[PDB]
């Protein structure tokens, strides 16, 4: 259909009270044409901060390849950590670059920062432009109706138990609204003394 | 001393001012072959000499068709000439294409000339050791020029290349007035005497050795090559 | 800035220093020998080591270039590299082209010819090194071409070359030309005893790589080449008792 | 201390020497008779345990032009892949014949490229140190030129070139005629040959080639070699 | 002269001066040779190892040789015995390699 | 020419295994006025000399400290001009670089960018390299602050350190009097004693130039305020 | 001309090599020892640090051990200057290779580059060349742990154990004796170090602050990379002080046995 | 037309490729494959367009077995999709139209096999099994419905028998049956076809 869609795909971060929380969906078909109910679009750099990318899958790989050789090189420069902040910079610089070319992207951050021990979230564009996000953040084809079910199910304060039901009916819903039929979803759950990851149990056709 | 720091610089000056770079040229030319040039001024005429190395040779040619009304002798080294030559045939070229003219031959030496001479006045580039008697039949009559690699132009009813050079010049001031605006016979039979003065003169005259070579009011670029040259003598 | 300029010179009476000078380099250098049979090429080499904290991880004279052929090489490791790179991505060049490998003479001929490009071109001059180029082809013929930095190839029977060539090369001219049957075990033989000459004593000094036809290429064992010296001493001791007793 | 100097005789230096590196190589004949050339070269050896068999000096430019070089061989090696090329463009163009003299110039021109000055565009610091003996048949007949490593061409009909080249070219003058049968100079040009050597006289370090119109550019087998020794 | 090729060819002129002559490196056989005259010289023991020393050595002259001989008599002397002992040998022979050397190597051409 | 000229460098290797150009300008610092540098921990103090020698001048005219940024501040020993011109090169870069990321600077990043420009200097020829020495002075949170550059291209961290002329004889001088806890005003004292013990040609508030980094980076000094310093304690 | 300012740099001569190569290494020669003791388990890497001061400063340990990988670390003697150029490419190839192939570079890779660089200013560049020496410390997951070495004149190697800085010779013959092929621990190591670099040391006193040390060794990821805190490395040093002491003690207890002199 | 099929059993893997030998629009012959052998411990199956298969198998190969020589080691058939999958991804970018679906079909000496589906948006993933092209349609739910993850080697061959007689009785294309090749550890082998 789209540049971003022939595999669809969505991705949500919520955030609870001390721990924050990032849970997209995965599948791999190629056009419309289902061949497996994998592929990870989210990948970490350090245990704690999360990135999760929404373009084509082929795009998805090289700009995470990117973000590597990047991130790598500049914390050993300067030989001290990358701060969450530092990351969304970096992504903003290579959205800018990719602008011209057909390599259009949606970046979401999500970790919380336990060498300060805030929450930290953002969302941004596939024009280039960063937006700070807070408590949900949505990400992928379905963004109109995900945004309206973040505006309704979300409540001030959250616990990681709450925080997962929350994350999972989202995640329930979300399945039913794609024609790709993008089975098999993921949740990491994270806090500054654990992450849990979780696969969902969820329809197969 | 200081022979080598002359070589150096091709920036050179020194205390009178001299460059040596000149000097090493002007030897050059003295150490070629044998070329007079002649002109009545309606026809012109050159007696030049071709040379062979050795017995079971047979000379090499030194007098060059630049073109159906334009042409010269050499007078130095065979090698940097032919890149000279394409060149001007090419500039020849173009004039025909674009703008269907001759071109005065007086207006294209002084081209070539300075072209040549911006590379002396900046680093890199030795001097060419080959100097020409240039001569072509344009709209105002045949006219004659001596180019030399020290880029001395200068338009002379007759003059002389080749050692013991002065010797066929002043016989060529003496019959100067005798050559007039006519005769092609009477220019030829001068140049053959005149020849000889360039010469040791113990090397007694050949045909194999001598070409002539006219152009004139109807005619054009021929050559008259070895034993072509008994007719006229 | 860019650096055009002339690092060579020319030569001032019909010799150019350099390559004189590259000539020497290759004296000081180690010692190789190559000889052919007819189902057989034999690289042998010399080694100095005194070490035993060094590892043997380390690479060796003769270098691997397309499956039947081997370069050996005196001069730098480094500049070998470089050489051994240009042909190994020219063999596949060819292969894609010619669709199988070539000659070997052909793959000679194209290291050399860079050599001469760097002396004949300005701001660029040869590395100097002299190497040894052997292998077969489909062919069970041997070949060993000779490479040397006048930027000139040919072929031989055999060779021997670098440090103390005189005393060896004499040596092979007699070994040799009483064969024209095979005797590989011989052969190896032969070349041991052509480079026990140069070592000074020790197997410990020595290292043959033999290279016979239908891919086989084989470094020996510490235990063959004991065995091989324990047949040779043997010999001459038995022989020239053998001599004064016979009287004819 | 350039080299990119003309010199203060204005005969630049490097030419010079060339001809000492000459001198140090071996000898090349060449007779061009009334119908069709020779050249003869020597090849050598020295060891019993070379292959010159691998070895030759004396190449085929073409099928009606050939050429012998003489000098620091690894030059002559470049200078003939430009000229090889050159000759075939003309064919692409116009399916045609080159003469043996247009082929040369053209060789020329590249024999002035050297220093980095402003009288020659730089590629090369120097130039080829070789002399070649150019050879061809075409409607101008056999003839033979004499390429000097000066960057001229000189036409000869009998010339050699070499370390003994100086008494060569005295005794070359006896023999020649201008009128002499070709198997006959293939005698008169074995004797000056087996006169320079100081090793065995053999077919195998020796070479032959002619050229004849009735049956192209063809080199000389070591069975005619041999048959060529036993008549002198 | 230390090094000919300071030397200038105006000096050497042929036709007066037609040899040069050049020693050789040390070589590993020569190091035994010149050794055993030297021992000779001195006293001597049956727990002396010569090929050992000699092998432990690698680009020294004879004179450095006749220095370490000299140099382990000296030792024995303070001890006030004429028995000499395999220790003496590598005090000595550490001595002098610790003296020249202090450069990074240029080997491992292989 | 234009791309002619010395492609290989002045500096050459030596049999000595020293690099001659590099030695000479040890002395091309040797000649700088007096400076100093006391790193206050909460603070810094940078100082020197302002020598005059015409009483024909106009304000406080030129400088010999700048600001890069508004966090990291240059002061130096060598040679003017060179001064000048090295703070603009990198001073435009440490914008550039900055402003891409709208994190704020880290020390050691400005270091590595100064040392490179000198050492493609050294790498280079036609060009010299500058003789300067730099003490780069910052400040930024709980980090350690206090470095100096060389015309070498090394770096080092540093307490306390000396330039200008007779930087040995300072420098032991510092060494024994400054130990343990100070304050910011205390560091300032002690700076002034030890430039007045290097020489004294006169000390005004026209003499002296100091600097410090403590809150929210480098702030410049009044006039009036070092003058009350000097009162404090002559 | 057009150049005639130069002093015939960088070219050949009677020599047979090349005098500016042969400079460089008188210079590598003066800067502190630097030791890698290779084992079966793990690699030990040692450095003897140069001048130190109160006014001076410590803001990593990393001032002499640089990692150029998370499984590649190197010694480095020569000038700062020079070096801190030369580690920025290094680091930056096993990057691309990473990018591309998705996984880490083999050691002898990036051995290879470096020499490259080097060889190509001889033959001709127009820029000096440079002299460097690095010490590998590094691991593989199917060749196991690799030390190397490299030196500036194209000649790299592989090594159990060597040393490279002052009094190079003496240090690599007493290295030679102590060792035994195979059979090698990292407690063995831990003293195996120090009683070297104590005879190369003229500095009567031992001190954990004149040395840096670290271990490399293999559990979790590819590597768990380890860098010795000074109380360790003190520790280390008092233990084998004791030791020293007690051979000398026993040797004098063997001398009185014997017959007294 | 353009079709290729794999299967990954634990102890070898079969694919199904294509084959031409002179095909316009008509049939006379059939014998070519459009597969390369990228060495002999992986092979690769491709299509697309018809020129640039040749154009871009031939770079690949004549690389892989420099890195070979030069390490004097050998890639995992992972290593090299990845490798593959970079370049074709610059390629698509790029003016030139280098847009082919290839088949990575690799045994890992002491990982176990691996099969590899690439796709022309470049897209790399590894299946049990998986095919594409017009063969796909039909052999896919045999595959699904008769393979159980694990199964016998004995089982495949006749698993692979019943593609051909369901591409029979459909009925597609014009030319008959496919090439069935067996990649194993043990190099390379053939499974005849009727």
Redesign the interface.
Do not use: C, H, S, W
């Given at each position: 259909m789209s540049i971003m869609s022939?595999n669809g795909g969505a991705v949500m971060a919520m955030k609870g009270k001390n721990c924050v929380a990032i849970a997209a969906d995965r599948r791999?078909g190629?056009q419309a044409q289902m061949?497996?109910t994998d592929?990870q679009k989210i990948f970490p750099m350090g245990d704690r901060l999360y990135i999760g990318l929404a373009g084509?899958?082929?795009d998805v790989?090289?700009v995470a390849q990117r973000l590597k050789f990047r991130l790598n090189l500049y914390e050993l420069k300067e030989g001290r950590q990358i701060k969450p902040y530092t990351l969304m910079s970096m992504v903003a610089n290579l959205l800018y670059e990719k602008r011209f070319?057909?390599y259009y992207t949606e970046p979401v951050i999500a970790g919380l920062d336990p060498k300060t021990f805030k929450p930290f979230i953002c969302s941004l564009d596939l024009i280039g432009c960063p937006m700070v996000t807070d408590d949900f953040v949505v990400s992928g084809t379905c963004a109109e109706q995900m945004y309206g079910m973040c505006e309704s199910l979300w409540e001030p304060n959250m616990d990681p138990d709450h925080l997962f039901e929350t994350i999972s009916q989202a995640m329930l819903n979300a399945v039913d609204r794609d024609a790709v039929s993008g089975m098999g979803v993921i949740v990491h759950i994270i806090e500054k003394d654990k992450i849990t990851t979780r696969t969902l149990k969820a329809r197969m056709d | 001393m200081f022979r080598n720091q002359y070589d150096n610089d091709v920036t050179v000056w020194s205390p009178q001012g001299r460059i040596h770079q000149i000097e090493y040229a002007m030897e050059a030319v003295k150490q070629g072959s044998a070329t007079v040039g002649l002109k009545s001024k309606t026809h012109a005429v050159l007696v030049a000499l071709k040379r062979a190395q050795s017995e079971l040779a047979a000379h090499q040619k030194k007098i060059l068709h630049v073109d159906n009304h334009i042409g010269i002798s050499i007078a130095g080294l065979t090698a940097d000439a032919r890149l000279l030559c394409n060149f001007m045939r090419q500039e020849c070229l173009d004039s025909r294409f674009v703008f269907d003219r001759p071109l005065p031959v007086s207006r294209l030496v002084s081209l070539i000339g300075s072209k040549t001479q911006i590379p002396t006045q900046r680093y890199g580039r030795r001097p060419y050791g080959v100097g020409l008697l240039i001569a072509g039949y344009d709209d105002m009559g045949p006219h004659i020029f001596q180019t030399c690699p020290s880029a001395n132009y200068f338009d002379c009813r007759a003059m002389s290349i080749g050692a013991r050079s002065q010797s066929a010049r002043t016989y060529l001031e003496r019959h100067m007035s005798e050559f007039m605006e006519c005769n092609l016979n009477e220019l030829v039979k001068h140049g053959l005497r005149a020849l000889r003065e360039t010469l040791p003169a113990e090397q007694d005259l050949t045909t194999k050795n001598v070409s002539i070579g006219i152009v004139g009011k109807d005619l054009e670029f021929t050559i008259y090559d070895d034993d072509d040259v008994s007719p006229f003598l | 800035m860019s650096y055009d300029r002339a690092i060579t010179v020319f030569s001032p009476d019909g010799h150019l220093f350099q390559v004189e000078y590259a000539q020497e380099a290759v004296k000081k250098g180690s010692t190789a020998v190559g000889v052919r049979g007819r189902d057989i090429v034999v690289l042998g080499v010399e080694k100095k080591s005194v070490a035993k904290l060094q590892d043997e991880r380390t690479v060796r004279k003769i270098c691997?270039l397309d499956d039947n052929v081997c370069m050996a090489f005196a001069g730098l490791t480094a500049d070998a590299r470089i050489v051994i790179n240009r042909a190994?991505?020219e063999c596949?060049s060819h292969?894609?082209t010619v669709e199988d490998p070539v000659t070997v003479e052909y793959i000679t001929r194209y290291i050399a010819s860079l050599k001469q490009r760097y002396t004949q071109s300005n701001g660029r001059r040869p590395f100097g090194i002299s190497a040894l180029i052997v292998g077969f082809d489909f062919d069970g013929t041997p070949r060993l071409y000779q490479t040397d930095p006048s930027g000139t190839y040919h072929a031989w029977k055999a060779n021997a070359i670098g440090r103390g060539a005189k005393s060896v090369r004499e040596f092979l001219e007699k070994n040799y030309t009483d064969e024209a049957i095979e005797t590989d075990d011989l052969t190896i033989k032969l070349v041991i005893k052509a480079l026990l000459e140069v070592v000074q004593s020790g197997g410990k000094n020595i290292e043959l790589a033999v290279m016979r036809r239908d891919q086989s290429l084989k470094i020996l064992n510490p235990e063959e080449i004991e065995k091989y010296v324990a047949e040779i001493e043997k010999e001459k001791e038995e022989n020239e008792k053998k001599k004064q007793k016979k009287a004819s | 201390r350039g080299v990119n100097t003309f010199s203060p005789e204005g005969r630049l230096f490097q030419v010079e020497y060339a001809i000492e590196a000459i001198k140090l190589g071996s000898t090349a004949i060449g007779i061009q008779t009334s119908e069709g050339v020779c050249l003869a070269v020597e090849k050598r050896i020295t060891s019993p345990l070379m292959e010159p068999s691998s070895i030759e000096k004396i190449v085929e430019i073409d099928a009606h032009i050939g050429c012998a070089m003489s000098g620091l061989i690894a030059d002559a090696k470049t200078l003939i892949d430009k000229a090889r090329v050159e000759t075939q463009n003309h064919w692409f163009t116009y399916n045609e014949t080159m003469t043996v003299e247009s082929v040369t110039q053209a060789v020329s021109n590249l024999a002035l490229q050297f220093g980095e000055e402003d009288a020659d565009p730089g590629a090369m610091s120097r130039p080829f140190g070789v002399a070649l003996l150019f050879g061809g048949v075409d409607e101008k007949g056999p003839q033979l030129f004499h390429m000097d490593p000066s960057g001229t061409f000189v036409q000869c009909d009998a010339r050699a070139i070499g370390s003994a080249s100086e008494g060569a070219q005295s005794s070359l003058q006896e023999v020649y005629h201008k009128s002499m049968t070709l198997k006959e100079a293939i005698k008169s040009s074995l004797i000056i040959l087996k006169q320079v050597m100081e090793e065995k006289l053999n077919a195998t370090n020796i070479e032959l080639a002619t050229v004849q119109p009735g049956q192209n550019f063809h080199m000389f087998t070591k069975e005619e070699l041999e048959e060529v020794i036993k008549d002198i | 002269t230390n090094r000919i090729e300071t030397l200038d060819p105006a000096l050497i002129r042929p036709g007066r001066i037609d040899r040069k002559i050049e020693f050789p490196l040390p070589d590993e056989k020569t190091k035994k040779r010149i050794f055993q005259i030297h021992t000779s010289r001195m006293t001597l023991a049956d727990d002396v190892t010569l090929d050992d020393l000699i092998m432990a050595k690698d680009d020294l002259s004879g004179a450095d040789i006749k220095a370490i001989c000299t140099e382990a008599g000296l030792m024995a002397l303070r001890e006030r015995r004429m028995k000499v002992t395999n220790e003496d040998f590598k005090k000595s022979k550490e001595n002098v390699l610790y003296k020249k050397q202090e450069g990074t190597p240029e080997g491992l051409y292989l | 020419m234009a791309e002619r000229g010395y492609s290989f460098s002045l500096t050459t290797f030596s049999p000595s295994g020293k690099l001659v150009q590099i030695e000479y300008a040890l002395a091309a610092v040797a000649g700088g006025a007096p400076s100093v540098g006391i790193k206050a921990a909460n603070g810094v103090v940078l100082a020197t000399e302002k020598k005059q020698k015409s009483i024909l001048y106009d304000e406080r005219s030129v400088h010999k400290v700048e600001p890069i940024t508004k966090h990291i501040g240059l002061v130096y020993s060598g040679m003017g001009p060179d001064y000048r011109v090295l703070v603009h090169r990198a001073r435009k870069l440490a914008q550039q670089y900055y402003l891409v990321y709208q994190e704020p600077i880290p020390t050691a990043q400005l270091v590595q960018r100064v040392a490179s420009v000198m050492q493609e200097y050294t790498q280079s020829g036609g060009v010299r390299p500058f003789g300067v020495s730099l003490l780069i002075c910052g400040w930024n949170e709980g980090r350690p602050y206090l470095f100096q550059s060389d015309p070498s291209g090394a770096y080092f961290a540093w307490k306390a350190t000396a330039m200008g002329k007779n930087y040995v004889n300072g420098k032991t001088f510092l060494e024994k009097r400054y130990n343990e806890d100070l304050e910011l005003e205390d560091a300032i004292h002690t700076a002034i004693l030890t430039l007045k013990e290097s020489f004294e040609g006169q000390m005004t508030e026209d003499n002296i130039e100091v600097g410090i980094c403590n809150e929210a980076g480098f702030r410049r000094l009044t006039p009036t305020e070092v003058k009350d310093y000097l009162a404090a304690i002559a | 001309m057009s150049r005639r300012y130069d002093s015939r740099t960088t070219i050949f001569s009677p020599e047979g090599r090349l005098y500016q190569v042969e400079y460089a290494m008188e210079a590598i020669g003066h800067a502190g020892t630097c030791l890698g003791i290779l084992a079966n388990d793990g690699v030990l890497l040692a450095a003897e640090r140069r001048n130190i001061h109160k006014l001076l400063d410590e803001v990593f340990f990393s001032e002499k051990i640089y990692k150029l990988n998370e499984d590649m670390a190197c010694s480095v003697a020569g000038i700062t200057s020079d070096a801190n150029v030369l580690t920025n490419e290094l680091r930056l190839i096993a990057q691309r290779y990473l990018?591309?192939?998705?996984?880490p570079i083999?050691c002898?890779?990036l051995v290879t580059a470096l020499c490259d660089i080097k060889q190509a200013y001889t033959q001709f560049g127009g820029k000096r060349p440079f002299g460097v020496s690095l010490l590998y410390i590094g691991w593989d997951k199917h060749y196991g742990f690799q030390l190397y070495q490299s030196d500036p004149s194209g000649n790299y190697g592989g090594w159990k154990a060597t040393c490279i800085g002052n009094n190079s010779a003496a240090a690599v013959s007493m290295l030679k004796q102590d060792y035994k092929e195979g059979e090698m621990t990292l407690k063995s190591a831990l003293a195996l170090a120090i009683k070297v670099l104590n005879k190369t040391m003229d500095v009567s006193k031992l001190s954990a602050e004149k040395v840096e040390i670290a271990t490399l060794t293999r559990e979790n990821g590819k590597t768990v990379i380890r860098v010795l805190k000074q109380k360790e490395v003190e520790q280390l040093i008092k233990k084998h002080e004791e030791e020293e002491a007690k051979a000398e003690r026993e040797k004098k207890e063997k001398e009185q046995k014997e017959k007294d002199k | 037309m353009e079709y290729l099929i794999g299967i990954q059993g634990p102890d070898y893997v079969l694919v199904a490729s294509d084959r031409v030998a002179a095909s316009n629009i008509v049939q006379m012959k059939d014998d070519h494959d459009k597969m390369f052998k990228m060495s002999e411990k992986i092979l690769l199956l491709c299509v697309g367009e018809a020129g640039d298969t040749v154009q871009f198998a031939?770079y690949i190969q004549?690389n892989v077995?420099?890195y070979k020589?030069?390490?004097?080691?050998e890639?995992s058939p992972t290593?090299a999709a990845?490798?593959t999958?970079?370049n074709l991804?610059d390629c698509?970018?790029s003016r030139t139209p280098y847009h082919v679906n290839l088949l990575l079909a690799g045994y890992d000496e002491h990982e176990g096999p691996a099969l590899y589906?690439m796709?022309y948006?470049?897209?790399?993933?590894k299946?049990p099994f998986?095919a594409h092209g017009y063969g796909a349609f039909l052999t896919l739910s045999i595959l699904d419905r008769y393979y159980t993850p694990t199964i016998s080697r004995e089982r495949a061959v006749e698993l692979l028998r019943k593609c051909l007689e369901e591409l029979q009785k459909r009925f597609i294309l014009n030319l008959p049956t496919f090439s069935v090749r067996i990649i194993d550890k043990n190099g390379i082998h053939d499974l005849d076809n009727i």
């Open positions: 022939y791999f190629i061949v497996t592929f084509l899958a082929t790989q090289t070319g057909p | - | 691997a190994r991505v596949q292969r894609l | - | - | - | 990018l591309q192939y998705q996984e083999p002898e890779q | 031939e004549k077995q420099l020589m030069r390490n004097g080691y890639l290593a990845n490798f999958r970079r991804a698509l970018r589906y796709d948006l470049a897209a790399l993933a299946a998986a």
